[PDB]
Amino acid sequence: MEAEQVWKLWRRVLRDERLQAQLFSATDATHWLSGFSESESKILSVYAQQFDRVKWFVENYQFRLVNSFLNALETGAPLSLRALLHINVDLNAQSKAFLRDRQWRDYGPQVYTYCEDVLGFLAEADELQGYPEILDLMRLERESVRLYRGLVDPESLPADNRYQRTSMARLYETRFALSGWLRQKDQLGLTRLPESTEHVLIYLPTLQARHKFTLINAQAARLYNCLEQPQSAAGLFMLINSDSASVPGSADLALLDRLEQLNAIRKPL
Amino acid sequence: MPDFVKPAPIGVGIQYNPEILDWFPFEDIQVDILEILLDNIMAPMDGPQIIKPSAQAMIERLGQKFTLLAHSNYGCDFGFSALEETAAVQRHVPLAKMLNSPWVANHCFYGDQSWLDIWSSPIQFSAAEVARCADRAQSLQTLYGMPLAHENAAYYLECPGAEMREAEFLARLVQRSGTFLHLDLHNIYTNHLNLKGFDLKDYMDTLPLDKVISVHLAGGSWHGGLYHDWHDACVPEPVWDLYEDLLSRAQPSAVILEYQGQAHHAQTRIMDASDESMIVRDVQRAQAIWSRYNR
Ligand SMILES: [Fe+3]
Ligand SMILES: [Fe+3]
């Protein structure tokens, strides 16, 4: 019995609720599924007695996994968690529903990928479909998760004498005026929000600091949307999406001066 | 650094697992060492950050006053995945260096890119696992740049395919890897009670007590409870007997007292926190016993 086979065996056991039920109900050798491989059943045969501990170990696994659903939310989407906790959604019922769809997967240190899959799963929850303001808040937090994940191994880009879009900032065009919740977090999920679009910029001051939300003008969002690929500083001022063919100067220079200050763009030099 | 040695004795402290429920109960200047669970200050590995930016503030606030020890749990140290890919070398190794920790301790469990599979899975006591785990322990200690201790594990089911006893496993592990031991006395007591043929006397004589750097004193569940190792109640008297006996045989570098976290550690426990001075009595008794066998 190699140690890796004993670990691989249990790793298969506590991810499939079907295999756990036949183990709990059957203590007899062949009454538990002999469909387990002979090498596997050999390791199951050691647990013939003290099968009570098996149900206790599996129950503690899913208990911690249900709690990790909340820890992943606190890490990635702390404001969405406070909004969901204020409207009283059974996050335990949503944890079990989410984890069973993933076959009780242990994300481990992959907390941002955990939270990203959680926010996507919660975006389709029927309980949350009646709360469009929170659904807008969670998509904002999902961009923050994608901001961190996009900075794990970012594609390096030199100066290249062109306006470049960095990897330390993202933009989110909201559906509701989420700034009312960001400026008054005690009202998260509790108050009502107008359905006006906002351009909130998720940016990191330093690489070892908490991401911050701030609003930018629609013209600054136009400059950020045109810098998806780095532009030649002259084509960018031309690329107002066929609306303007003239350089605005200080009208658009100060906007670019703020974006670089927010670690959102890279000026050409 | 070429050869890691046991540091000079630095004293007794508490584990600071309650990041909030301990600063106000913290008293006087008697305790100048506190343990730090590196998992709580850990940042996600699918992110670019090493430490939680909220945790960087207290490390600044606490590193100046108290020496802060490291504790690696859920780091997947003795797993089957590549050591370079584990959370130990990607997060726990830099965190201990950032904390300026004199040494670091792990756990004798199993983990492969997973956090909550590690408890209730002790390492298979076999010469095959002795060789594999010692090679990882020596390499991991080399990456830490500090002594690496292995905490004795409390478990209800011994891993199948066990060729030897737990004490011989740890003695063969630290002798082949050159690492050290982190003696959790309460884990020995709960293993002596809930396991057939666990010789408590042979356990202490087998272990290279000259390899113990740190000690853990803790309480447990009372008779009749669902399961044990709750780390909540008062430190049992048999655990106090092991603390006085260990200090009369070897010389550790520190001893820490641990308690439960915020949420219920197991399936069903409580949150109450009103017996704050019982901790002071448990610490003070350890302080007196420490000086009774002081260097
Ligand atoms: Fe521990
Ligand atoms: Fe411990």
SS (H, E, C) chain A: CCHHHHHHHHHHHCCCHHHHHHHHHCCCCCCCCCCCCHHHHHHHHHCCCCHHHHHHHHHHHHHHHHHHHHHHHHHHCHHHHHHHHHCCCCHHHHHHHHHHHCCCCCCCCCHHHHHHHHHHHHCCCCCCCCCHHHHHHHHHHHHHHHHHHCCCCCCCCCCCCCEEECCCEEEEECCCCCHHHHHCHHHCCCCCCCCCCCEEEEECCCCCCCCEEEECCHHHHHHHHHCCCCECCHHHHHCCCCCCCCCCCHHHHHHHHHHHHCCCEECCC
What token pair was written down for A163?
């306006």
CB B241 within 8 A of CB B235: no
In a domain, B61, yes or no: yes
**Rounded Cα–Cα distance for residues A97 and A92 (Å):** 8
- What are the angstrom distances between the C-alpha of B81 and each of A208, B15, B76, B101, B110? 28, 29, 8, 26, 11
Q: Name the residue among A143, A150, A85 with its Cα closest to residue A115.
A: A143
Chain B contact for A97, CB < 8 A?
no
Q: For residue B84, is it within any domain?
A: yes
Handedness of CA B166, B167, B172, B174 (dihedral sign): positive
A154-161 own/partner pairs: CB under 8 Å, 24+ apart? A157/A230, A157/A266, A159/A266, A159/A268, A159/A269, A160/A230, A160/A268, A161/A233, A161/A268, A161/A269
Neighbours of B275 (CB within 10 A): 12
Q: Does B229 count as an annotated binding residue?
A: yes
Spatial contact of B88 and B125, defined as CB atoms under 8 Å apart: no
Strand-pair partners of B217: B257
Q: Is residue B156 part of a domain?
A: yes
Query: To the nearest whole angstrom, how far is the Cα of A234 from the nearest Cα of chain B?
Result: 33
CA torsion sign for B232, B235, B237, B238 is positive
Token code pair at residue B237:
């008297």
Compute how many other C-beta atoms are within 10 angstroms of the C-beta atom of residue A60.
18
- CATH code of the domain containing B239: 3.20.20.150
Distance CA A223, CA A251 (A): 12
Asked if B152 and B108 touch (Cβ cutoff 8 Å), the reply is: yes
B44 domain residue, yes or no:
yes
**How close is the Cα of B71 to the center of ligand 1, in Å?**
7
A29 touches chain B (CB under 8 A): no
**What's the CA-to-centroid distance between B150 and ligand 1, angstroms?**
9
* Beta strand segments in B196-235, E: 212-217
Taking residue B34's Cβ as centre, other Cβ atoms within 10 Å add up to: 19
Q: Alpha-carbon distance A53 to A32, whole Å?
A: 16
| CB A177 within 8 Å of CB A215 | no
User: Per the annotation, does B71 bind a ligand?
Assistant: yes
Name the residue range of residue B54's domain.
11-293
Q: Which of A211, A126, A213 is nearest to A174 (CA)?
A: A213
Which positions ≥6 away from A123 have C-beta within 8 Å? A135, A138, A139
Determine whether A69 is exposed, middle or buried from the number of CB atoms within 10 Å of its CB (0-12, 13-18, 19+). buried
Structure tokens at B285: 């008794």
Smallest Cα–Cα separation from B125: which of B60, B188, B67, B169?
B169
How many beta-carbon pairs under 8 angstroms link A with B? Answer: 114
Residue B3 lies inside a defined structural domain of this protein: no
Q: Which backbone phi and psi does B202 adopt, to 5 degrees?
A: -65, -30
Give CA separation, B44 vs A113, A217, B90, B115, B117, in Å.
9, 32, 10, 12, 17
Would you call B6 exposed, middle or buried from its count of C-beta atoms within 10 A (0-12, 13-18, 19+)?
middle
Question: What is the H or E stretch that residue B183 is in?
Answer: strand B180-184
Which two structure tokens, joined as six digits, stand for A116? Answer: 């990203």
**Is B228 labeled as ligand-binding?**
no
Q: Which residues of A touch B123 (CB under 8 A)?
A: 3
For residue B60, how many C-alpha atoms fall within 13 Å in the half-sphere facing its CB? 7
**Chain B (2-61) residues lying within 8 Å, Cβ to Cβ, of chain A:** 42, 44-51, 53-54, 56
What CA–CA distance (Å, rounded) separates B188 from B54?
A: 35
Cα angle at B140 between B137 and B142, to 5 degrees? 110
Distance CA A138, CA A136 (A): 6
Cα distances (angstroms) measured from residue B263 to each of A73, A109, A111, B266, B267? 16, 20, 19, 9, 10
- Tokens 């399961």 map to which residue? B227
DSSP secondary structure code for residue B195 in this structure: S
Nearest to B154 by CA among B121, B130, B197: B121
CB contact under 8 A, A6 and B159: yes
The answer to whether the annotation marks B223 as part of a ligand binding site is no
Q: Is residue B227 within 8 Å of B187, Cβ to Cβ?
A: no
Q: What's the CA gap between A160 and A24, in Å, rounded?
A: 64
> How far is the CA of B201 from the CAs of A9, B92, B197, B210, in angstroms?
34, 34, 11, 17
Domains of chain A by start residue, with CATH: 3-135 (no CATH), 155-266 (3.90.930)
Give the gyration radius of chain B's Cα atoms.
18
| Cα end-to-end distance, chain A, whole Å | 63
Contact B40, B182 (CB under 8 A): no
Beta carbons of A82 and A125 less than 8 angstroms apart? no
Consecutive H or E run containing B255 = strand B254-257
Give the residue ranges of DSSP H helices in chain B. 55-65, 87, 93-98, 127-144, 166-177, 185-193, 200-206, 237-247, 276-292
Put simply, the answer to whether A112 touches B266 (Cβ < 8 Å) is: no
Structural domains counted in chain B: 1
β-bridge partners, B70: B36, B104
Contacts of B44 (CB under 8 A, 6+ apart): A75, A109, A110, A111, A112, A148
Distance of CA B280 to CAs A63, B27, B31, B88, B277, Å?
32, 8, 10, 33, 5
Q: Which residue from B52, B45, B106, B96 is spatially nearest to B75, judged by alpha carbons?
A: B106
Q: Which residues of chain A lie closer than 8 angstroms to B128, CB-CB? A: 2-3
Beta-carbon separation of B160 and A107 below 8 A: no
Cα separation, B104 vs B146, whole angstroms: 7
Within a domain: B1: no
Q: Which of B225, B226, B208, B293 is nearest to B255 (CA)?
A: B293
Do A114 and A169 touch, CB atoms closer than 8 A?
no
Is the CB of B119 inside 8 Å of chain A's CB atoms?
Answer: yes
Residue B6 lies in a domain: no
Kind of pairing between the strands at B67-71 and B104-107 = parallel
CA nearest to A52, candidates B157, B24, B70: B157
Give B120's contacts in chain A (Cβ within 8 Å).
57, 60
Is B166 part of any domain? yes
Nearest by CB to residue B156, choosing from A53, A110, A151, is A53
Torsion-angle region of B262 (φ positive above 0: left; ψ -120 to 50: alpha; else: beta)? alpha
Tell which phi-psi region holds residue B11, choosing left (phi > 0), alpha (psi between -120 and 50) or beta. Answer: left
**Alpha-carbon span A267 to B4, nearest angstrom:** 49
| Helix, strand, coil % over all residues of chain B, rounded to 5 | 35, 15, 50
**Both structure tokens of B156:** 């209800």
Q: Which residue has the tokens 């004589």?
A: B205
Q: Is residue A171 within 8 Å of A221, Cβ to Cβ?
A: yes
B195 touches A at CB < 8 Å: no
* Spatial CB neighbours of B167, under 8 Å, sequence gap ≥ 6: B202, B203, B206, B207
Distance in Å from the first CA to the final CA of chain B:
24
Radius of gyration of chain A (CA): 25
d(CA A66, CA A71): 9
Measured CA to CA, the distance from residue A183 to residue B236 in angstroms comes to: 51
Distance B153 CA to ligand 1 centre (A): 8
Which amino acid is it at B137?
A
- The method of structure determination was X-ray
With the C-alpha atoms ordered A62, A67, A73, A76, is the resulting torsion angle positive or negative? negative
B221 touches chain A (CB under 8 A): no
Which chain B residues are within 8 Å of A117, Cβ to Cβ?
none
Which residue of chain B comes nearest to A111, CA vs CA? Answer: B44
| Gap between the Cα atoms of B247 and B241, Å rounded | 10
Q: How far is CA B146 from CA A145, B104, B105, B231, in A?
A: 34, 7, 10, 28
Instruction: Give the closest ligand to the alpha carbon of residue B73.
Output: 1
In 10 A of CB B251, how many CB atoms?
A: 16
